[PDB]
Write a protein that binds this DNA or RNA. Structure first.
Lengths: 83, 75, 97, 109, 95, 95, 109, 83, 97
DNA sequence: CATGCACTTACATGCACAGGATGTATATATGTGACACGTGCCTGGAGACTAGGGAGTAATCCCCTTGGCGGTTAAAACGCGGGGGACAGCGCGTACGTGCGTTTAAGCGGTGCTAGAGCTGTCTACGACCAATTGAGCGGCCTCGGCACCGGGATTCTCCAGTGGCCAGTGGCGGCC
DNA sequence: GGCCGCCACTGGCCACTGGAGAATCCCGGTGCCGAGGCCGCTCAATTGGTCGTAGACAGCTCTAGCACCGCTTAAACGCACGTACGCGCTGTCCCCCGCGTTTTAACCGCCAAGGGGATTACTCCCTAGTCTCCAGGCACGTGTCACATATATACATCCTGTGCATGTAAGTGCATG
């Protein structure tokens, strides 16, 4: 029922695709897991706030505008999903 | 045409004779002063110095290969 | 003889491709698994609108890509072409993360 | 014997709703009172910004020979205008991608 | 039937047609447009509220918003916005 | 004749002698504390107002303030502030 | 006829003024109505955070052998607590100076 | 009354002092005029905001209150000046 | 022989001094003069509170100092000990200006 | 006849350009659904009036800001050896791009079903609002002790003159041929 | 007898050391002015009571999310293998830095002007609010062409095979020792 390893679901080729979108042509092998940790850290940074909005709404299901609120709180304002 | 680069290299190493050997950049500037287009002949100078090192005529002071300092044999 | 491109040529080719493309580079369902796993660490039995998971997604690769141009400029600043996690630490620290 | 119901956006010659913006400012809790011309000014400014960004988007869509506005065109428009980019530096765009950017050292000789 | 949800589609569509009769629009780009307009409206409204708070003014006038237009909107866009908003203010002043 | 100006000096002075009877204070450090309390008050108030708008709640309660401080204050500071405020609102409720 | 007036800060038993903070929130345009316990909760969390930073400042002053806290003590206190540090990473202190910090390769040998 | 070259009023040893407080061990000679331009661009940003506040106040006297408004509007909040 | 310290020793000493110190590092009068000079460019006959000038001096010094710690991070990242113009340009670009 | 030198000739190596492959670019076909437009509607924006109060404006004064001289150096600046550091070049050994077969799991798509988001009647807790009143919180003043400044020791760090060890250069000796 | 290898001496280079010198702190003494504590005012926090209403709750519903199940195929994965990239070494030039000397203007201290910030008073312009009404945009529904995908073709590009110029080495004949 619980989950234990989904950080490996962000595969190395997906990270390579992102770095190509980032303009990186050559990627060391030490990159991938450290970037996994960084993106993970960003994930609890947003999702703790998102959970806080969701429980403060007295909802049990996470909704998208809560994510919008959390991201613009962190100065990472997302367009296309408000309301 | 003229002589090959080897006479230029041995003249460069015989020009100054410090306690340490002459270096790659110092010999390149020496041949630039003496007159040679060193900019396209870096591989030529590298192969010439390495070949003449293998002859035992020059002994490399501190560096390895084409880097470092370069000085003439005992005799 | 089987053809083989020199290194970087293909890499620059998909660089141009993915800079041209806009589509999402992350497998959707492993990302959703990771979101639900991390969310369970704060509140159990959480349920997600799929749009919320999507919004979390483009937020994630937006942060990640912008990090990579930052680290790429740091790496060429370091006169190198291969990125190392020290570049990432530098970018995170300069951004004040 | 009431007057005919005329609209304030037409009174200012504008497309954005003066009444909706006025209601949002009244219920957005920014002050206890608001001047009459203030939502008119706000709607005019928003209309100008939307007009210029839509014009840039239409030019971008024309450059990519598509007749319909795509958020890729929005990314290309916003990231290529300096004052807009300074306005929207910290803004995350849906489906925007990035500008095509290759550093000079990344290209071969 | 459901509750009415107000959106910015019709107004942006009209200004799109008067700047480009020829082109079309995608609806999720329109969601981006709603987010953009709501974002800038919120930014300017919050700045105007701050300014009236500083000057102890209970009333937001167009002077406050115009000041905020100098504050947030960068440079040449700000002078343009002063021009269009000012002439619109004069037109509404003339009813 | 002058006009009365608000500051938070005296309450911080009671707090300081509560926590450190032996420790003094410089007045510019108190100016920094005044900027501190005003800034954090403004942050919590703005977060509470925007949260109240998000759920369309026209009244801000201690639940909203708790949500806001949980958002802005991290973790250890957050949990102890939650505990202190919970005790305070509880003993006020008994009063 | 009328009972002796008891302040809400005293009813909470906390030092920050409940009535002043409630008045500020009433005149600060945040909601049309405020729950009674909300400014009390605000005053409590404010007094907790000011108390803890005052502990840090007093410890800094005692380490510097000074009776009265100074902005340098405030700098040293606020930068060495990580939650406080990233709480006020973008917040600047007058005459605070900086942390004593030297990178490793800057040292000789 | 009318002054011209006061960007040079931020003298080079003052920039060295700022660098030593910044933990700089060695400074290139090209640095100082660049830093002069940088502190310039920053300063007309902040004082343009401050001037905008001041004219909004119908004042010609600039207050530190307006300055701290301008700095916190750029996300660079300063403590200790009446805020 | 006369005494002479080796390079960097005095530099490290003044680093320790100015990290220990709290005062402003630039002269008051030319800073106020430059502030009046540049503020004159927007609107004429502006009068300045001394507190406003001192606060602007504090904010400017702190902003510059933080920029030099970012520059130090870039320089040590570039395996150098001398700061370089490209380091400040990089740091400014990474911060988003 | 031998030998050094020069001359000639063959081979290795770096550079240039043609040629094929290939992945991307360029040309219709289509069928589809997203997009755009007609339509009912209701609710939200607008018209008329009112009341009252927030803001605009006159007056003033005073306090704070501006303007100016003169020592007084600290600080800025200039100059100069000279060490230390940016940086070019190279070797080199690697770790990562590239290519290709495999497995897997990601995705499509299709069904079932339900928590749960969300919408709507109710009524009551609760909070804003008005009259009085006071006591706590702020202006003002004084004073005094924490603290700034200074001067003399003690320390502390650091750089540089000696200091021995180590390593390789060097000459002399003995054996060998 | 000379030559060659060995052996022992020796000089230079490199890590170690004590001491000197300057910087830095620390301790004691002195004045001096912000902390803070007391006093007086006032205004706003409190008390009390009221009206109205915001929202919590009850309840319902229908809908979107969760689960599952089968198929499929592309993506990941992993192995091979070459090559280009970090990066350490070496060196080399030159760039600021420490250390002075000269200069200069910052600052403090003092003094005079006046200007506009701020404060109070008065007023009226404006706008929130209420009642009424009607039409503007929104949900719904439905046709429809823009384009995503598919297929065929062209070209750009990229690697690579080959062909050329040039440097170098070797042989050898010829002039001469």
């Amino acid at each position: 029922k619980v989950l234990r390893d989904n950080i490996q679901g962000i595969t190395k080729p997906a990270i390579r695709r992102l770095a190509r979108r980032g303009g990186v042509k050559r990627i060391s092998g030490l990159i991938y897991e450290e970037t996994r940790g960084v993106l993970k850290v960003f994930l609890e940074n947003v999702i703790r706030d998102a959970v806080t909005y969701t429980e403060h709404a007295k909802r049990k299901t996470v909704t998208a505008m809560d994510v919008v609120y959390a991201l613009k709180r962190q100065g990472r304002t997302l367009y296309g999903f408000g309301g | 045409s003229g002589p090959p680069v080897s006479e230029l290299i041995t003249k460069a190493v015989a020009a100054s004779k410090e306690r340490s050997g002459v270096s790659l950049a110092a010999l390149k500037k020496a041949l630039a002063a003496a007159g040679y287009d060193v900019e396209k002949n870096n591989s030529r100078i590298k192969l010439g110095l390495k070949s003449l090192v293998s002859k035992g005529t020059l002994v490399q002071t501190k560096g390895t290969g084409a880097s470092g300092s370069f000085k003439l044999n005992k005799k | 003889k089987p053809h083989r491109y020199r290194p970087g040529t293909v890499a620059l080719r998909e660089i141009r491709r993915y800079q041209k493309s806009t589509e999402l580079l992350i497998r959707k369902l492993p990302f959703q698994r990771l979101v639900r796993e991390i969310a369970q660490d704060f509140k159990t039995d959480l349920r997600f609108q799929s749009s919320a998971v999507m919004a979390l997604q483009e937020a994630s690769e937006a942060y990640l890509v912008g990090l990579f141009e930052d680290t790429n400029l740091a790496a060429i600043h370091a006169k190198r072409v291969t990125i190392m996690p020290k570049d990432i630490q530098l970018a995170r620290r300069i951004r004040g993360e | 014997a009431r007057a005919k119901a005329k609209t304030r956006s037409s009174r200012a010659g504008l497309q954005f709703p003066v009444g909706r913006v006025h209601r949002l400012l009244r219920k957005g809790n920014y002050s206890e009172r608001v001047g009459a011309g203030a939502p008119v000014y706000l709607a005019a400014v928003l209309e100008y910004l939307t007009a210029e960004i839509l014009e840039l988007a239409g030019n971008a869509a024309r450059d990519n020979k598509k007749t319909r506005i795509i958020p890729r065109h929005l990314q290309l428009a916003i990231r290529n205008d300096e004052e807009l980019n300074k306005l929207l530096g910290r803004v995350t765009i849906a489906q925007g991608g990035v500008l095509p950017n290759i550093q000079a050292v990344l290209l071969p000789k | 039937k459901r509750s009415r949800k107000e959106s910015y589609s019709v107004y942006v569509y009209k200004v799109l047609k008067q700047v480009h009769p020829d082109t079309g629009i995608s609806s999720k780009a329109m969601g981006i447009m709603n987010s953009f307009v709501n974002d800038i409206f919120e930014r300017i409204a919050g700045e105007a509220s701050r300014l009236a708070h500083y000057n102890k003014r209970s009333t937001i006038t167009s002077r406050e918003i115009q000041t905020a237009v100098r504050l947030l909107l960068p440079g040449e866009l700000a002078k343009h916005a002063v021009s269009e908003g000012t002439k619109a203010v004069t037109k509404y002043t003339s009813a």
